[PDB]
Design a protein around this nucleic acid. Structure first.
Ligand SMILES: [Mg+2]
Ligand SMILES: [Mg+2]
Ligand SMILES: [Mg+2]
Ligand SMILES: [Mg+2]
Ligand SMILES: [Mg+2]
Ligand SMILES: [Mg+2]
Ligand SMILES: [Mg+2]
Ligand SMILES: [Mg+2]
Ligand SMILES: [Mg+2]
Ligand SMILES: [Mg+2]
Ligand SMILES: [Mg+2]
Ligand SMILES: [Mg+2]
Ligand SMILES: [Mg+2]
Ligand SMILES: [Mg+2]
Ligand SMILES: [Mg+2]
Ligand SMILES: [Mg+2]
Ligand SMILES: [Mg+2]
Ligand SMILES: [Mg+2]
Ligand SMILES: [Mg+2]
Ligand SMILES: [Mg+2]
Ligand SMILES: [Mg+2]
Ligand SMILES: [Mg+2]
Ligand SMILES: [Mg+2]
Ligand SMILES: [Mg+2]
Ligand SMILES: [Mg+2]
Ligand SMILES: [Mg+2]
Ligand SMILES: [Mg+2]
Ligand SMILES: [Mg+2]
Ligand SMILES: [Mg+2]
Ligand SMILES: [Mg+2]
Ligand SMILES: [Mg+2]
Ligand SMILES: [Mg+2]
Ligand SMILES: [Mg+2]
Ligand SMILES: [Mg+2]
Ligand SMILES: [Mg+2]
Ligand SMILES: [Mg+2]
Ligand SMILES: [Mg+2]
Ligand SMILES: [Mg+2]
Ligand SMILES: [Mg+2]
Ligand SMILES: [Mg+2]
Ligand SMILES: [Mg+2]
Ligand SMILES: [Mg+2]
Ligand SMILES: [Mg+2]
Ligand SMILES: [Mg+2]
Ligand SMILES: [Mg+2]
Ligand SMILES: [Mg+2]
Ligand SMILES: [Mg+2]
Ligand SMILES: [Mg+2]
Ligand SMILES: [Mg+2]
Ligand SMILES: [Mg+2]
Ligand SMILES: [Mg+2]
Ligand SMILES: [Mg+2]
Ligand SMILES: [Mg+2]
Ligand SMILES: [Mg+2]
Lengths: 169, 54, 211, 36, 296, 159
RNA sequence: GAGAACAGAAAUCUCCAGUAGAACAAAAGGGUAAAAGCCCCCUUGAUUUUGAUUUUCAGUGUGAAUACAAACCAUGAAAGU
RNA sequence: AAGCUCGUAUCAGUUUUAUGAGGUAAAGCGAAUGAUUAGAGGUUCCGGGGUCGAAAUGACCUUGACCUAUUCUCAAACUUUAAAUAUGUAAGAAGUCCUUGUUACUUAAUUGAACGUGGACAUUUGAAUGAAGAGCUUUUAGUGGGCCAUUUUUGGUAAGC
RNA sequence: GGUUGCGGCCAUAUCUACCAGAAAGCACCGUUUCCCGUCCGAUCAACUGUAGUUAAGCUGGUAAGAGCCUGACCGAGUAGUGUAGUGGGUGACCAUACGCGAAACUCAGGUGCUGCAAUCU
């Protein structure tokens, strides 16, 4: 019974896991910067493996949080790249979803070999109204089970919009 | 050479020879270690109560 | 090499287990504690005969294993591999120390030497379940294991059904009603407490208010 | 012009420079897909 | 409630619950301790906080002292009260904060007796000032600002109540660097700006900024302000209007009897459901044993 | 060798009274103390400043000084064969008003009451405590109380 | 735990569960969740003056520590610390 | 040893009552942590095996570890609980209560705090038992190798250790 | 009685799953000119109270629910323990006398109470 169980997108976060520092990242962040409009966030390495040739705190990734209408733009702008179809995996049982795309030039943006080509992780986190309880300061509460985003209810929301299809099993 | 190390053997008997005896409570006990700001005022408070009764 | 058992008969020290501190301890000389048809069901073996200590002593893991094999052997050899369920009910967690002899008794803290189980008076050592047709045989098994042990211990027939904590009539009342439900070695029981719906998928045979 | 330098910071108490417990070669797979 | 997540009897047995008012995310006890507690050499003289909270668009300002059996309210003043005083809309604006500030900033002092004494600042030019003590006379009422779980950002309205509480006459120790118009770099304050916020100059100027660039969001936002024919100008005078109005009478008159209390006790208990008897539960589950297991 | 630090052996003494950890509830800072109050000493392991030494745990004494965070408590410590006067500067969180006198104060008001009502009518005062006296004669009836004759029980095994 | 190009057990991103199972130089034991832990901002109270107190004790000393007094400061809207 | 000030005054290796503190004994482990026997049921795109397999994020067997509800057994340096014996304080005249001075402290405040004046209630004046009384000061000897028994208890196979 | 702001005790208050909530209040909720903060007006700041919903919050009820709290001659006068004997026993250990006396278990009952202020069919 929903007058108010009306699923929004809360953030979309792009993320390019450039497994090194320096030029390749400061350009892959430029990529999100002329995809987001926002200044993106460098992510430091957590620990050191040296199979991946990295060091703890090395600035080896960039990501960016985009919200509201601007998120629908980039979401659909990349949902095209995947033909409006992703899989029955790929949905968290907690309701959210995301996808990956190599060759980031299929999002409108031009090629400019002063950067090269990058892949992106797309993650779409969704929620109904009144997600404030979980993230506001005063009286931080947790939402009723009646109201939390589930998987079955969010693939149906994904089918209903976009004329997507769900996938095998 | 190894001698005995320690004991409290017989030390209660000695303590009780001249007993263990109570701490001799005093009306008007000492003011040792009482807030000086309070003492400074309490001094003038009582020179006041004293000079009063003349 | 192994010191004679009289040097550790009595519970002279406080429990010295394997620990973050003790930690150098040899392996127990008894490592298997269930024997025979341990997979059997509770109905399979109503009768239960205990070997119970009458002393406050320590039983060496060396003597524990040595006595389980002596008993379990005699049992199978005259009853069959799956004719009985033998459970030894004392695990030897107490580490015995030893002082390895140009010095004296300066700094004389022992190194671990062996293990032992600390048994009270009335403490059960061997518990074994079979069906009453056996009892003569299995009793005679415990009697022979007894000879492996320091200190008087006595056999006794349980008033209980096998390894259950209920006497036989109280058990039959419980099962010929339908409150018992088999489990691998053991059984579960019908609680009057907890969720009623989740109480009825398990033990459905009951609630006919009849057999 | 390279974009402004904003760096995420982590809430993890762990400060040692060591792989976490699950990061162990035990949990790989013998003949995982390995595109040929 | 994913199967991989349900909590053990062991988890719940050994679990320590926080204080109720912390479970309700309502009290900063770490803050409450250091607000409430008093210097032990003063021995009842209570630590009066000026609690300032914010409903979704209504402003609460009580002055509370604490007691082992429960905090006791000396005076209260609500930002829904300003209708009484000349104010009708948006009673959450910074200038309603200042208003209710002023309101309890005078309400108590008459309830106390320092009303003719300690009138506060009246000619409100928006200066930074504290209500200084009088030569050879009682020291001003001293209370401290319990802002609860508000996050003290520069120029927020919790400090608007502060400015009015301070300006009414209460002695509330406070600095200036989180009063709107504090300059980030030069450690100084613009009073021309703060007097604005005390009165409205940021919402008045919002009105004169929407009346000729967007009449389609001025349409509904500020709906009321058109519906009573008063434009921006003109706003400084609905607030100085009230400043006079409360300094003249603070008196708290309360609401009219209006279906007296026992009637409410009746017409809400219709909706308060009371627990079931043990025999009911015993039969309620004795229904179920027949209705489910007894072969339908 | 041996170790005798200021908090040696306090492991469980300063332990935290389980499922009651956390910030101390606020009543203990709302309690007030005047010179001469008889207070108990129990340390609060959460509050390391101003805490009593272990010896004064479980001990009771009298307030001789009051300051902003702390009371000063006077304690009679027995060293050798004689008592010495020890003066502890303790934090309010380790201090508890004592019910050790509460009978005596409850009983002095009750005494003067019975004394008021004793000089009020013929003077029958009778207000000193006496210990439990032995029972008085009584008559045990057997109406519906005829006795169960009990015998000792034989030896069973039960295991 | 469930999820996202390369990406693999381990790189980075998101949500959910999470009474502390972490972290707080070190030994261990206490203690700590809008913190005592993590990130950030401002700092030098690790300062000045001479006393009292607790532990060890002879109720000496030293080490260490506690609660006030008198200064001059730090921080915070603030009470405070 | 010398005494000295006092004397029904206070006094006590005791009980009683009122109120505290404690983590040992026991107990506990289908409570935390750490051990430990046994099955039963689960669970993987996610350990290795292994029939059908071109493969599969594939079905299926297998042994594994994890989860669930059970099961045998344990702890000086584990524990929710938790004794006995020991242990702090209180049981009046230095009491209780009221009236309203002093101050430079403290309060919004003659508010409080502390110390005071005047006043009201006598030995059932506030439990038991005892008391060849109680308290106080000075100076000095010898000693500063100890050993034994019940109980508790460490090391040691043990010892008249 | 409901509700809010501030509370005291800090699970009889927490956990799991359902269900109901009038009025008012809280809430979710709209906006980005201004102070303020962010990678993101999500949080934080401000503005509106207008445009919107009881969906969630929050309140209450249900459950042979988990946990928790209480009670009982439930277990148990058991375990342990102070005191005694030129008591038993080779010993290990054990019984008796005068006292004190648990924990588990088991059954039964219970599921927040309450202070100040304001407000409500
Ligand atoms: Mg709705
Ligand atoms: Mg690389
Ligand atoms: Mg020598
Ligand atoms: Mg010798
Ligand atoms: Mg010597
Ligand atoms: Mg012994
Ligand atoms: Mg020994
Ligand atoms: Mg040797
Ligand atoms: Mg030699
Ligand atoms: Mg050595
Ligand atoms: Mg060594
Ligand atoms: Mg035992
Ligand atoms: Mg034998
Ligand atoms: Mg059992
Ligand atoms: Mg960190
Ligand atoms: Mg359970
Ligand atoms: Mg704070
Ligand atoms: Mg030591
Ligand atoms: Mg906590
Ligand atoms: Mg410190
Ligand atoms: Mg540590
Ligand atoms: Mg220094
Ligand atoms: Mg020493
Ligand atoms: Mg000396
Ligand atoms: Mg010297
Ligand atoms: Mg010293
Ligand atoms: Mg010194
Ligand atoms: Mg030292
Ligand atoms: Mg101990
Ligand atoms: Mg223990
Ligand atoms: Mg024990
Ligand atoms: Mg127990
Ligand atoms: Mg366990
Ligand atoms: Mg385990
Ligand atoms: Mg083919
Ligand atoms: Mg008891
Ligand atoms: Mg005593
Ligand atoms: Mg006499
Ligand atoms: Mg005499
Ligand atoms: Mg001499
Ligand atoms: Mg010597
Ligand atoms: Mg000599
Ligand atoms: Mg003797
Ligand atoms: Mg010897
Ligand atoms: Mg409504
Ligand atoms: Mg806000
Ligand atoms: Mg609803
Ligand atoms: Mg609420
Ligand atoms: Mg509720
Ligand atoms: Mg229950
Ligand atoms: Mg005994
Ligand atoms: Mg004798
Ligand atoms: Mg004997
Ligand atoms: Mg016995």
């Amino acid at each position: 019974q929903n007058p108010m169980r009306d699923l929004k997108i809360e953030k979309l976060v792009l993320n390019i896991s450039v497994g090194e520092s320096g030029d390749r990242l400061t350009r892959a962040s430029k990529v999100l910067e002329q995809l987001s409009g926002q200044t993106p966030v460098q992510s430091k390495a957590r620990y050191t493996v040296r199979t991946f040739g990295i060091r703890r705190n090395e600035k080896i990734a960039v990501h960016v949080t985009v919200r509201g209408p601007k998120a629908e733009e980039i979401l659909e702008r990349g949902l095209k790249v995947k033909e409006y179809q992703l899989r029955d995996r790929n949905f968290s049982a907690t309701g959210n979803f995301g996808f990956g795309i190599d060759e980031h030039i299929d999002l409108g943006i031009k090629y400019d070999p002063s950067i090269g080509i990058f892949g992106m992780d797309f993650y779409v986190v969704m929620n109904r109204p009144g997600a404030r309880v979980t993230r506001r300061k005063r009286c931080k509460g947790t939402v009723g089970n009646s109201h939390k985003t589930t998987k079955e209810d969010t693939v149906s929301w994904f089918k209903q919009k976009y004329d997507a299809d769900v996938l095998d099993k | 050479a190894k001698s005995k190390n320690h004991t409290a053997h017989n030390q209660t008997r000695k303590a009780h020879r001249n007993g263990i005896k109570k701490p001799k409570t005093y009306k008007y006990p000492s003011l040792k270690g009482v807030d000086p700001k309070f003492r400074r005022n309490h001094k003038h408070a009582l020179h006041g109560t004293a000079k009063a009764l003349a | 090499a192994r010191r004679p058992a009289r040097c550790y008969r009595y519970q002279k020290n406080k429990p010295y287990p394997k620990s973050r501190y003790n930690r150098a301890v040899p392996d127990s000389k008894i490592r298997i504690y269930d024997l025979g048809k341990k997979k059997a069901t509770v109905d399979e073996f109503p009768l239960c005969v205990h070997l119970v200590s009458n002393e406050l002593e320590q039983l060496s893991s060396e003597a524990l294993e040595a006595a389980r094999i002596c008993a379990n052997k005699y049992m199978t050899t005259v009853s069959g591999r799956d004719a009985f369920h033998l459970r030894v009910r004392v695990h030897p967690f107490h580490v015995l120390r030893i002082n390895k002899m140009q010095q004296g008794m300066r700094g004389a803290w022992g190194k671990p030497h062996g293990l032992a189980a600390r048994v009270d008076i009335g403490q059960i050592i061997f518990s074994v379940r079979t069906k009453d047709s056996n009892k003569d045989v299995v009793v005679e098994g415990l009697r022979r294991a007894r000879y492996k042990f320091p200190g008087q211990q006595k056999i006794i027939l349980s008033k209980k059904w096998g390894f259950t904590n209920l006497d036989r009539p109280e058990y039959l009342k419980k099962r010929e009603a339908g409150e018992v439900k088999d489990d691998g070695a053991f059984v579960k029981f019908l609680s009057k407490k907890g969720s009623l719906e989740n109480n009825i998928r398990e033990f459905p045979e009951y609630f006919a208010a009849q057999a | 012009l390279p974009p402004k330098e904003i760096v995420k910071s982590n809430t993890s108490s762990k400060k040692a420079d060591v792989p976490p417990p699950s990061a162990d070669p035990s949990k790989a797979r013998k003949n995982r897909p390995r595109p040929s | 409630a994913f199967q991989k997540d349900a909590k053990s009897s062991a988890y719940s047995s050994r679990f320590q619950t926080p204080f109720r008012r912390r479970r309700e995310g309502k009290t900063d006890y770490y803050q409450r301790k250091r607000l409430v507690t008093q210097h032990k050499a003063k021995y009842n003289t209570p630590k009066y906080r000026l609690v300032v909270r914010f409903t979704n668009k209504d402003i609460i300002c009580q002055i509370i002292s604490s007691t082992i059996t429960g905090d006791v309210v000396l005076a209260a003043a609500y930002s829904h009260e300003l209708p009484r005083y000349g104010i009708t809309h948006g009673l959450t604006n910074w200038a309603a904060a200042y208003a209710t500030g002023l309101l309890i900033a005078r309400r108590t002092l008459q309830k106390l007796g320092l009303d003719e004494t300690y009138k506060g600042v009246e000619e409100v030019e928006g200066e930074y000032e504290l209500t200084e003590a009088v030569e050879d006379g009682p020291r001003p009422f001293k209370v401290f600002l319990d802002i609860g779980l508000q996050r003290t950002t520069t120029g927020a309205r919790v400090f608007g109540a502060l400015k009015g509480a301070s300006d009414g006459g209460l002695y509330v120790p406070h600095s200036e660097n989180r009063f709107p118009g504090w300059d980030f770099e030069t450690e100084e304050i613009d009073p021309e700006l703060l007097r604005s916020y005390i009165f409205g100059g940021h919402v008045s100027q919002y009105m004169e900024e929407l009346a000729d660039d967007d009449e389609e969001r001025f349409s509904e936002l500020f709906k009321g302000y058109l519906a009573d024919d008063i434009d921006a100008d003109s706003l400084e005078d609905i607030y100085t209007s009230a400043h006079e109005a409360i300094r003249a009478d603070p008196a708290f008159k309360p609401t009219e009897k209006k279906f007296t209390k026992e009637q409410y006790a009746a017409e809400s208990k219709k909706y308060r459901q009371t627990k079931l008897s043990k025999e009911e539960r015993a039969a309620r589950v004795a229904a179920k044993i027949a209705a489910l297991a007894g072969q339908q | 060798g041996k170790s005798h630090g200021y908090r040696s052996r306090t492991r469980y003494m300063f332990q935290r009274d389980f499922r009651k950890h956390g910030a101390v509830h606020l009543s203990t800072y709302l309690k007030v103390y005047k010179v001469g109050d008889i207070v108990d000493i129990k340390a609060n392991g959460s509050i390391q400043k101003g805490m009593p030494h272990k010896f004064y745990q479980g001990k009771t004494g009298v307030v001789y000084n009051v300051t902003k965070s702390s009371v000063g408590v006077i304690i009679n410590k027995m060293v050798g064969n004689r008592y010495l006067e020890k003066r502890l500067n303790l934090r309010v969180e380790h201090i508890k008003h004592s019910k050790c006198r509460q009978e005596f104060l409850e009983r002095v008001k009750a005494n003067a009451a019975k004394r008021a009502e004793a000089k009020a009518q013929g003077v029958a005062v009778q207000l000193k405590r006496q210990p439990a006296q032995p029972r008085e004669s009584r008559i045990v009836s057997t109406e519906g109380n005829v006795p169960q004759t009990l015998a000792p029980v034989p030896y069973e095994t039960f295991i």
